[PDB]
Amino acid sequence: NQKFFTLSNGNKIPAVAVVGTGTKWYKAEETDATFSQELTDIVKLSLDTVPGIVHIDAAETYKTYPELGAALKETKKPREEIFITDKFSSLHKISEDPKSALETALNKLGVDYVDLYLIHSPFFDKDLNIDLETAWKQLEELYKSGKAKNIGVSNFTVEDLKKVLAIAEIKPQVNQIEFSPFLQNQTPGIVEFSQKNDILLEAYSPLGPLQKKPTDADQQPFYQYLKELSEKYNKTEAQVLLLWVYKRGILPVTTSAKIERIKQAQDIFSFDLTEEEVKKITDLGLQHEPVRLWHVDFYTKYNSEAQ
Numbered sequence: 001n002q003k004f005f006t007l008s009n010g011n012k013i014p015a016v017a018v019v020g021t022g023t024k025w026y027k028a029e030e031t032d033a034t035f036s037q038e039l040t041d042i043v044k045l046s047l048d049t050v051p052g053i054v055h056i057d058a059a060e061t062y063k064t065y066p067e068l069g070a071a072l073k074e075t076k077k078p079r080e081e082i083f084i085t086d087k088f089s090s091l092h093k094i095s096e097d098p099k100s101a102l103e104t105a106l107n108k109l110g111v112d113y114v115d116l117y118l119i120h121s122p123f124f125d126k127d128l129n130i131d132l133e134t135a136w137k138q139l140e141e142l143y144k145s146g147k148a149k150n151i152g153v154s155n156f157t158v159e160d161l162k163k164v165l166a167i168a169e170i171k172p173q174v175n176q177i178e179f180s181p182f183l184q185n186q187t188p189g190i191v192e193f194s195q196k197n198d199i200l201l202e203a204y205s206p207l208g209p210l211q212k213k214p215t216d217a218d219q220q221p222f223y224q225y226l227k228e229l230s231e232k233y234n235k236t237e238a239q240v241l242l243l244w245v246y247k248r249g250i251l252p253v254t255t256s257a258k259i260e261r262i263k264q265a266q267d268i269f270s271f272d273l274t275e276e277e278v279k280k281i282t283d284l285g286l287q288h289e290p291v292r293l294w295h296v297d298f299y300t301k302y303n304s305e306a307q
Helices: 037-049 065-074 098-109 132-145 158-167 190-196 221-233 237-247 259-270 275-287 296-306
Strands: 004-006 012-014 054-057 082-088 116-119 151-154 174-178 200-204 251-253
Touching: 012 054, 037 054, 037 065, 037 259, 065 098, 082 098, 098 116, 098 132, 116 132, 116 174, 132 151, 132 158, 151 158, 158 190, 174 190, 190 200, 221 237, 221 275, 237 251, 237 259, 237 275
Parallel strands: 054 082, 082 116, 116 151, 151 174, 174 200, 200 251
Antiparallel strands: 004 012
16 A cells, blocks of 8 residues: 655655656757657546546656646546646756746646645756755745645755755755765765755666666676665565665655556555565665766765765
């Protein structure tokens, strides 16, 4: 049965997100010509066939609101069985500010509210005429009005979170970071700090080890063990890694275009990992060199602390 995290405000969030935009699907422009029927079809199929509350991870920067909106309109999946996470594009500006971004997104998606709204990066485009404090306060207002049921941030360091906490009326509920066995602290100490402060981590690119699965995998203890666990449980290697993230108290966010992988990700709560297994994945992961797929130009300088 489906598992949930409970945020600091008591609200529940499905403990895996399975509908996302993979890299192949990002768009540079949003026109009739660039509308992706293939993406809308996979989102619709997911909403139609994936059991339970389907957690969608969207973002302004992807320019895939039209495809999500068309799928949301065409499915009979009820709104209450969908959890929509959306993100203000701060690194490269599309809107003037979060309230503008979210109002535009709500309309394109054809919904009245999102379930979670994030600031996508702490590194604000020079062309934005708003600072972090002012942007957070806009999220606080979207929370108070109910346009965003929950609010948080993405790719924030400990120092960035502290800046928010110093000005916040509403404490951020989520920090979505890159997290995998090969990147166990996106920036120094972030996992421990977030968990101690009741800020839920989400992990994007949690399957980094399988995306970058190397030629000599069969001679690496990490991949040997991962295969062993897959065989033990009769589950995919991806499922084992996603479940490991959940067992670390973190919400894995995945972005497959393959419906059976999407269903498999939703179904991670069909099994469990023992305490020993969680610790062993952790430990073998930490022995591996870091793999970082996002915010590379900003955070490579932290790779020495990531494991």
